[PDB]
Amino acid sequence: GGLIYGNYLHLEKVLNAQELQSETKGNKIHDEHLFIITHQAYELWFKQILWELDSVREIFQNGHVRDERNMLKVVSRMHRVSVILKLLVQQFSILETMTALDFNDFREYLSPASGFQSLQFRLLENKIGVLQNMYRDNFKGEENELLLKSEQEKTLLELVEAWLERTPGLEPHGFNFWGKLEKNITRGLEEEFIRIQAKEESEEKEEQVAEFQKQKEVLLSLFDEKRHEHLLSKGERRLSYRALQGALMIYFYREEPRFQVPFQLLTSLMDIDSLMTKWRYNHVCMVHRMLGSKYLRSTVSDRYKVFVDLFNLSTYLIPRHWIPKMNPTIHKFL
Amino acid sequence: GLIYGNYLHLEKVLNAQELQSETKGNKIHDEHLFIITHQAYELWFKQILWELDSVREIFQNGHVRDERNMLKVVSRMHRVSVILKLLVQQFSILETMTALDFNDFREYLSPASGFQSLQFRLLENKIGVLQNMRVPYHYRDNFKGEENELLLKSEQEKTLLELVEAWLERTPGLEPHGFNFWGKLEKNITRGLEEEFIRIQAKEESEEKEEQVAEFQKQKEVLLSLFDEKRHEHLLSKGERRLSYRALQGALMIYFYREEPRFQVPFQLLTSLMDIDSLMTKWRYNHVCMVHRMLGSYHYLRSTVSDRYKVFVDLFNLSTYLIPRHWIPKMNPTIHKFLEH
Amino acid sequence: GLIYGNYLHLEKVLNAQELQSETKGNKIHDEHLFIITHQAYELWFKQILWELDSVREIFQNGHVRDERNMLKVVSRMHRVSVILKLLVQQFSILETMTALDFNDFREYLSPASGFQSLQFRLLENKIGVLQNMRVPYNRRHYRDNFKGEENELLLKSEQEKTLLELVEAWLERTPGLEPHGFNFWGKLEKNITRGLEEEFIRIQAKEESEEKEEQVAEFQKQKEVLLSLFDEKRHEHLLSKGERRLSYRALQGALMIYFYREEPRFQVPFQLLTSLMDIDSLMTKWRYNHVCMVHRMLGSSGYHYLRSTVSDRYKVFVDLFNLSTYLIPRHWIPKMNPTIHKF
Amino acid sequence: GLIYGNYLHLEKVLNAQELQSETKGNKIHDEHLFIITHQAYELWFKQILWELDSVREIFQNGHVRDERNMLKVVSRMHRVSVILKLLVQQFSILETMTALDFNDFREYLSPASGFQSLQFRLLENKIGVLQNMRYRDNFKGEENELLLKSEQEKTLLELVEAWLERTPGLEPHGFNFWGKLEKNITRGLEEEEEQVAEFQKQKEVLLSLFDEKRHEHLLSKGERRLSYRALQGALMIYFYREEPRFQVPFQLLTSLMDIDSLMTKWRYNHVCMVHRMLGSYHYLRSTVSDRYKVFVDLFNLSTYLIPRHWIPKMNPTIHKFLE
Ligand code: HEM
Ligand code: HEM
Ligand code: HEM
Ligand code: HEM
Ligand SMILES: O[C@H](C[C@H]1c2ccccc2-c2cncn21)C1CCCCC1
Ligand SMILES: O[C@H](C[C@H]1c2ccccc2-c2cncn21)C1CCCCC1
Ligand SMILES: O[C@H](C[C@H]1c2ccccc2-c2cncn21)C1CCCCC1
Ligand SMILES: O[C@H](C[C@H]1c2ccccc2-c2cncn21)C1CCCCC1
Ligand SMILES: C[C@](N)(Cc1c[nH]c2ccccc12)C(=O)O
Ligand SMILES: C[C@](N)(Cc1c[nH]c2ccccc12)C(=O)O
Ligand SMILES: C[C@](N)(Cc1c[nH]c2ccccc12)C(=O)O
Ligand SMILES: C[C@](N)(Cc1c[nH]c2ccccc12)C(=O)O
């Protein structure tokens, strides 16, 4: 009674799950089989991503992430989620071998089933941390229950936020990253202005003054906590002010041994956001090719990027020399 | 009301994941990826079988005789290669699993094997892999009951190789009464080889010249061996070739006159059959490299990455018999109009 | 003896890498990646223009009229889409450069601009992006980024026949449109009038259920969509507003190929229409990947102009895509009799 | 003011395309594809050499000893992997050239050879493909000089070897990894119709690890490449990858295997490409072998995988030494 391949993979279920509605209603359409397998393969891969993402969530929730031995496992699993998403984006290439005209021969047999009825796609969006401030009454029972759990349980965004708030170096009576960054950027701007004013009155000099004033407003706006809370409340920002500070600390001090793998995490979170919006864009394109002129387009935006704040740290890049120096004491803490 | 989950029978697809590591109270995280990865391969093997069997059926029932159906044949065979190309990239997901982590659940797999993939064997058999082509360690002893019944059917029913062969034997232009391609081709290669021997013999005695002589003499042996039907039967018997002499003629006719309207899509079909063989071999290669990365030290698998498992090896080997454009027999207005839709 | 390096002119290609950061005394490692990446895109843009110009010529010199040339036209157009697929994947190399590292050398690039890619503009023009339909960046015409010989080539590329115009002309001559022959358009209008009446009658026989109420609104929209197809005045209006590109007769040609693609003479022509949509869709994906790249490097107008290029405006063969709108059940399609089946 | 075309020296890059078929008054369309494809490979080979040299130099000049440099080292080796992946995919473009169309211009290529790609040889050498396991007649002048430098200057393999030898945990008077590992395996192998056969061959595999003389013999054959102490370093990083100081080192070892795999995948696609165009030179089939895998020792550590319970447990004092 040894283990057999087919039994191990429950192929008696996986390979007996293919029912063409076109056939069930006496008008078998060959390409319907493709439509079915493609969706079943997406849903297996959605199940794998939920498996990886729930395991990473738990490592944050149960405090194991506090032990930095576990940062390799956390980054390898998040990196794995992006490798799967890359395959899922490539996988539209298969459904592009189906013409609009052959889709047209079986689409009537699909009504009224909706993509909005993909539980796992909703679970994945909620568990990464997509805003509810955007419906979703398409579910009932055990399914409607899993959705509610996914809505109330801590999102990856919330768990990363809490961990970013504990980033070493933010302590005002320690390294005091924020205090020193505000000072160096202020002095840096004052120096850059004096350099600029010393010049003769060229139109070049006017385009420099105007560039300086733009730079000054953007960089100093980083230190406006009221502005951050206002933008948080409008949904344009997602991380707490202190989590923003921790992310920037990891960005600027990425080479410090304790920050190396955390920097790979932040990168991988941005990759997952990029690949999800590539998924949504290839899908929008697929729908247009099939139905022509005839909400999905609205989902291809920064509104749906959970880690929008990680992207927007590029806005606040400063000359390398303005970054507060690490002395031997804080070099060795890191 | 038809519902997404019900339409796709997700109550089966998403309730088919059972970790043996967990079953035996030592749940290993990466076993889940091992299961999903294979299940995804097996969904796509089923889709390939669906395309492939539909194309076999279009040859078998004679609908292929009506050239309206060539676009459908080429789209479905191209679709098979687009699927296989994703299946080759899909290994990159299993590469995110280290040897160390695989080693933690590996023992719970024994003794289930890849040889027990029914669909992989159905797919090999239906393209046209013969028992004689296969290396042992016999493949059918891994199966029983209705699975053993389906495999037998896969060996006994007409393969894509056989159905393509029958269709290539009927390629217009081969008829000795008509365009008489083979006769004109032998004439023009014999004539072209004579003109070439003459150009070379004209050159001043130099090491370069003697290098061109020996190059010509081997080229002359290769090109003229094309017309040796009994050399062809000998290569059939050793398994170095698979297509009938007449099928080989039909292939080479489509190859040289590809731009003639009636041959445009048939040329794309010959191209897709090579693609399918290349991508099956690339699958075999990535699978071998995957096993090496996970186990270190298998020799059977390395054997499978060779022309012995390429069903349409003859279509690759037509490149061997490339000649100068001007040697290709010219077409008169009557044979031009016969190759027009 | 011809040598590999001499044949490939590697003495030019591999001596064209000058880091501006090094030239001004502060060598930044990653600028070398920035340079190779662009040089690789520009070689491939040259290859695309070589394929594209060869196909334009085949239409322009009348060789396309001999249907034996269709395999060459479709292989070269398929080749263009295979290159564009690689160019889309090539962003993944430049994604290994972090915003912090790009920031160390961006100052040395000023004021060089992607707007100054001559090959990218030639490519857009030759496919058939019209200058009067371009979004202006910084309130200016794209051609004022260029002077002298380059400005002149761009003008030739705008004035010379575009791939859209040549395909348009070829589509106008599609067999089956002749009113005194198969009379495609006439038979299509009649079959759609009929199918619609038959569909109305099936629906009005279904109580007054909310499902029936829905099918009535849905029927009403499809009827307006399908019968607007036959309104040639509405088409000329949309042609002038640039919301369409193909002549009314070209649209008929395309829909003739779409519906009768399995007919032997239409099989490779259908592959050409597919490949033109592929090129549009892959140029849009390039524009999309470039936009995402600009965001990753600079954060959050220039970010908005690039977003404006990821739209149906810049899809030269948008009409081929929009034929999906005019899909009808297979049995409404005019049947082919033995006379036109054989032609 | 700086211009895009001048910054990129397009006046050189886009004026380097000479069809030999055209030069001899029989212009063959597909020859342009053949030239651009090779030019793109060579731009990318140049980028790989730039990355690979910067990494070699970080080892050679001692900066790798400062562990803050490990992110930079793994980023750039990962970048090499990503480029090599594009180059494997890039064969897809030359696959749009039929054998027949190649046949129309291949005569005008003779006698230029692939063996004359300088950068490809520079690349193989700098990584550390050994000469005794294999080309240089095909070059003269400055090119022949650069090839000698690339054979004589320290390879990536040599620099990685040196660095692996200093891997903390090997010191006999410290954690004594090798000592404790030999102990635990032998004690673990203590064990109680059947298939007792597997146990025996298994025992021989595991214990052959501790045969330093076997290793030196295989080292001289070129069937192994890493010094015995390098192999101890490597295995330490493998078993203790989670330890903070080993996490990025483990990524680097993975990247080095990735590069071997992708170079072989390039060799394999190239071999298929030759077979597609010329039919049935296949010396190239020999190059698709572990003989040409510089980091074969890193791949082979999978053979010496043991039950976790046997891996020497780590005490707090060494846990703290590995941060
Ligand atoms: C022929 C191909 C496709 C067409 C025509 C299509 C059509 C649509 C349409 C019209 C919607 C909007 C809601 C609705 O009417 O149901 C939608 C949403 C959706 N589709 Fe598809 N779809 C296609 C392929 C796919 C595939 C391959 C997947 C794979 C899982 C998928 C997953 C979804 C999901 C998850 C949604 C909800 C999207 C969101 O909320 O942002 N679709 N699709
Ligand atoms: C960790 C990854 C993998 C390992 C270690 C592995 C190992 C092996 C081994 C040892 C064999 C020889 C027969 C046996 O004992 O089972 C084999 C054959 C096979 N494996 Fe895998 N395999 C892996 C991944 C895959 C995947 C993802 C597939 C996808 C379906 C697959 C499909 C097969 C097939 C069909 C065979 C039979 C192939 C033939 O006869 O030519 N393997 N594999
Ligand atoms: C770090 C990567 C990149 C950044 C930050 C970047 C940035 C920009 C920006 C700001 C513009 C608009 C204004 C301007 O012309 O300066 C632009 C346009 C453009 N870039 Fe890039 N770019 C990047 C990579 C690339 C690459 C790899 C290519 C390859 C050819 C490219 C080609 C172009 C082209 C052709 C335009 C004009 C686009 C149009 O009119 O639609 N860029 N880019
Ligand atoms: C139609 C495509 C190709 C054919 C027929 C071809 C043919 C060959 C042949 C016959 C050799 C053996 C040496 C010789 O006789 O010159 C070779 C080696 C080589 N080819 Fe190609 N080749 C092709 C494409 C490419 C491409 C795209 C590259 C990209 C740079 C390339 C790079 C090389 C290199 C570097 C070698 C030396 C390889 C080694 O020692 O392992 N080839 N090729
Ligand atoms: O949106 C559904 C299709 C629906 C669906 C049904 C069954 C399985 C998967 C999917 C799916 C995925 N995205 C949309 N859908 C209709 C809506 C009208 C245009 C044709 C498709
Ligand atoms: O090779 C099989 C694993 C086997 C298998 C079992 C269950 C599900 C899928 C697979 C599979 C795929 N290729 C090989 N196998 C054994 C033999 C020793 C090495 C790995 C475990
Ligand atoms: O647009 C240029 C860069 C420009 C360029 C210069 C040289 C080589 C390639 C490129 C390129 C590609 N896309 C935009 N650019 C600036 C504009 C300001 C932000 C930093 C990028
Ligand atoms: O191998 C060379 C071609 C050679 C070459 C010449 C010019 C530019 C690039 C290349 C190349 C790449 N791989 C092999 N070659 C010949 C050898 C005889 C058969 C046809 C190809
Ligand atoms: C002990 C700690 N791991 C510290 C910590 C928090 N966030 C970080 C980000 C980067 C590096 C370290 C940290 C923890 O509190 O989880
Ligand atoms: C009538 C025919 N379709 C002729 C035929 C056979 N093989 C071909 C290959 C290419 C082109 C045509 C054919 C048939 O016999 O099927
Ligand atoms: C004789 C012709 N080759 C006819 C033609 C025009 N457009 C077409 C589209 C599909 C098929 C044929 C045509 C010509 O006039 O070019
Ligand atoms: C001080 C040290 N960086 C130690 C070292 C050597 N090899 C390693 C591998 C992994 C981790 C650390 C090391 C050095 O000597 O380089």
Domain annotation for chain D: domains and CATH numbers: 4-321 (1.20.58.480)
d(CA C121, CA C128): 10
CA dist D165 and D236 (Å) reads 11
Count the residues in chain C: 343
Cβ–Cβ under 8 Å, residues B283 and B309: no
**Residue of chain A nearest D66, judged by CA positions:** A257
Residue of C nearest to D98 (CA): C75
Task: Calculate ∠ Cα C228-C229-C234, nearest 5°.
Answer: 60
Structure tokens at C332: 């409404």
At B183, the amino acid letter reads G
Cβ(B275)–Cβ(B315) below 8 Å: no
Contact C324 A254 (CB under 8 A): no
Closest ligand 5 atom, residue A291 Cα: 19
Chain C partners of D2 at a C-beta cutoff of 8 Å? 20, 109-112
C114 lines ligand 7 (CB under 6 A): yes
Kindly report each contact of residues C188-192 with a partner whose C-beta sits within 8 Å and lies 24 or more positions away, as own/partner.
Answer: C188/C255, C188/C333, C188/C334, C189/C230, C191/C328, C191/C332, C191/C333, C191/C334, C192/C226, C192/C227, C192/C229, C192/C328, C192/C332
Integer CA distances (angstroms), B169 to B31, B163, B174, in order? 50, 10, 8
Alpha-carbon span B226 to A103, nearest angstrom: 46
Q: How far is B78 from D186, CA to CA, in rounded Å?
A: 56
Residues B112, A19: C-beta atoms closer than 8 Å? no
Beta bridge partner(s), residue C137: C140
Residues β-bridged to residue C140:
C137
Mutate: best of D7, D9, D13, D113, partner C, most C CBs <10 A: D13
Ligand 3 atom nearest to CA at C120:
35
Q: Which residues contact D308 (CB under 8 A, 6 or more apart)?
A: B104
- CA-proximal residue: ligand 11, atom 5 (nearest): C174
Q: Is B336 annotated as a binding residue?
A: no
Q: Tell me whether the omega of the peptide bond preceding residue D111 falls within 30 degrees of 0, making it cis.
A: yes
Structure tokens at D15: 């004026």
- Residue of C67, C70, C267 lying closest to B71 (CB–CB): C267
d(CA A120, CA A122): 5
Q: How far apart are CA C305 and CA C303, in angstroms?
A: 6
Going by alpha carbons, the residue nearest to atom 22 of ligand 3 is C294
Q: Which residues are CB-contacts of C293 (< 8 A; sequence separation ≥ 6)? A: C91, C94, C95
Out of B65, B170, B248, mutate this one to test ligand 10's pocket (max ligand atoms within 8 Å of CB): namely: B170
Query: Identity (one letter) of the amino acid at D88?
Result: V
Alpha-carbon distance of A111 to B341, in angstroms, equals: 40
B147 token code pair: 């699975």
> How far is C-alpha A308 from the geometric centre of its chain's CA atoms?
8
In angstroms, rounded to a whole number, what is the distance separating the alpha carbons of residues B251 and B262?
A: 13
A303 at C interface, C-beta within 8 A: no
C37 is in an annotated binding site: yes
Query: Measured in whole angstroms, how far is the alpha carbon of residue D54 from the centre of its chain?
Result: 16
Residue A130 CB coordination number (10 Å)? 19
Short-list C329, C321, C248, CA closest to C280: C321
Residue D138 CB coordination number (10 Å): 17
Residue that the structure tokens 């090129």 belong to: C279
Neighbours of chain D (3+ CB pairs under 8 A): A, B, C
Q: Give the C-alpha separation, A258 to A331, whole Å.
A: 10
Of C245, C274, C228, whose CA–CA distance to C74 is shortest?
Answer: C274
Is the Cβ–Cβ distance between D250 and D241 less than 8 Å? yes
Q: How distant, in Å, are the alpha carbons of B127, B280, C5, D279 from that of B317?
A: 18, 17, 30, 5
DSSP state of A170: -
| Structural tokens at position C8 | 């490939």
Q: Are B79 and A97 within 8 A, CB to CB?
A: yes
Taking CB atoms and an 8 Å limit, are C268 and B264 in contact across chains? yes
Ligand 8 lined by D111 (C-beta under 6 Å): no
- For residues D129 and D152, what is the distance between their CA atoms, to the nearest angstrom? 12
**Contact yes or no for B48/B123 (Cβ under 8 A):** yes
B187 Cβ contact list (under 8 Å, min separation 6): B329
Tokens 């490409």: give the residue.
D273
Contact present, B300 and B137 (Cβ < 8 Å): yes
Distances in Å between the alpha carbon of B244 and those of B55, B249, B278, B316, D93?
Answer: 21, 9, 22, 15, 32
Please check whether residue C104 is in contact with residue C28, taking contact to mean a CB–CB distance below 8 angstroms: yes
Q: How far apart are CA A115 and CA A121, in angstroms?
A: 9
Coil, helix or strand for C137?
strand
Q: To the nearest whole angstrom, how far is the Cα of C298 from the nearest Cα of chain A? A: 5
Structure tokens at A196: 């600029």
Contact present, A33 and B83 (Cβ < 8 Å) = no
Q: Which value in Å is the resolution of this experimental model? A: 2.3
Give the C-alpha separation, B264 to A64, whole Å.
Answer: 63
Cβ count near A70 (within 10 Å): 17
Out of C281, C299, C323, closest to residue A314 by CB: C299
Burial of residue B210 (CB within 10 Å: 0-12, 13-18, 19+) is exposed
**B174-B175-B179-B182 Cα dihedral, nearest 10 degrees:** 50
Single-letter amino acid, residue B142: N
Classify A206 in phi/psi space as left (phi over 0), alpha (psi -120 to 50) or beta.
alpha
Which residues of chain C lie closer than 8 angstroms to D18, CB-CB? Answer: 7, 9
Closest ligand relative to B301 C-alpha: 2
- Nearest residue to B126 via CA among B147, B105, B151: B151
Q: How many angstroms separate the CA atoms of B71 and B77, rounded?
A: 10
A256 touches chain D (CB under 8 A): yes
- Provide the sign of the torsion angle of the four alpha carbons B73, B75, B78, B83, taken in this order: negative
SS3 assignment for chain B = CCCHHHHCCHHHHCCCCCCHHHHCCCCCCCHHHHHHHHHHHHHHHHHHHHHHHHHHHHHHCCHHHCHHHHHHHHHHHHHHHHHHHHHHHCHHHHCCCCHHHHHHHHHHCCCCCHHHCHHHHHHHHHHCCCCCCCCCCCHHHHCCHHHHHHHHHHHHCCCHHHHHHHHHHCCCCCCCCCCCHHHHHHHHHHHHHHHHHHHHHCCCCCHHHHHHHHHHHHHHHHHHHCCCHHHHHHHHHCCCCCCCHHHHHHHHHHHHCCCCHHHHHHHHHHHHHHHHHHHHHHHHHHHHHHHHHHHCCCHHHHHCCCHHHCCCHHHHHHHHHCCCHHHCCCCCHHHHHHCCC
- Listed in sequence order, the DSSP H helices in chain C are 4-7, 10-13, 20-23, 31-60, 70-94, 99-103, 118-127, 148-159, 163-172, 184-203, 210-228, 232-240, 248-259, 264-298, 302-309, 318-322, 338-342
CA atoms within 13 A on the CB side of B141: 3
The one-letter code for the residue type at B262 is: R
Residue A77 assigned as binding residue: no
The tokens 């002309």 sit on which residue? C169
- Secondary structure of residue D268 in the 3-state scheme: helix
D303 near D205, Cβ under 8 Å?
yes
Rounded to whole angstroms, the Cα distance separating D137 from D121 reads 12
What is the spatial distance between Cα A289 and Cα A292, in angstroms, rounded to a whole number? 6
Please give the Cα distance from D284 to D113 (Å, whole number).
13
Q: Decide if B147 contacts B121 (C-beta within 8 A).
A: no
| DSSP secondary structure letter of residue A155 | P
Q: Are C118 and C147 in contact (CB under 8 A)?
A: no
Q: How far is CA D136 from the centre of its chain?
A: 21
Measured between alpha carbons, how far is D173 from C309 in angstroms, rounded to an integer?
A: 66
Q: Which of A93, B287, A314 is nearest to C89 (CA)?
A: A93
- CA distances, C282 to each of A216, A300, C91, C276, D18 (Å): 40, 17, 13, 10, 29
Count of CB atoms situated within 10 Å of the CB of D89: 16
Quick check: helix, strand or coil at residue D226?
A: coil
Which of D64, D66, D68 best probes binding to A when mutated, by most A CB atoms within 10 angstroms?
D68
Within 8 A by CB and 6+ apart from C104, the residues are: A320, C21, C28, C30
What CA–CA distance (Å, rounded) separates A3 from B288? 23
In a mutational test of the B interface, the residue from D240, D242, D305, D309 whose CB has the highest number of chain B CBs within 10 Å is D305
In C67-147, which ranges are continuous DSSP H helix? Answer: 70-94, 99-103, 118-127
Question: Quick check: B85 contacting C, CB < 8 Å?
Answer: no
Helix/strand/coil percent split, chain D, to 5? 70, 0, 30
CB D96 within 8 A of CB C79: yes
Q: How long, in residues, is chain A?
A: 334
Tokens of D227: 């010094």
CB atoms within 10 A of CB D92: 15
Structure tokens at B77: 């065979």
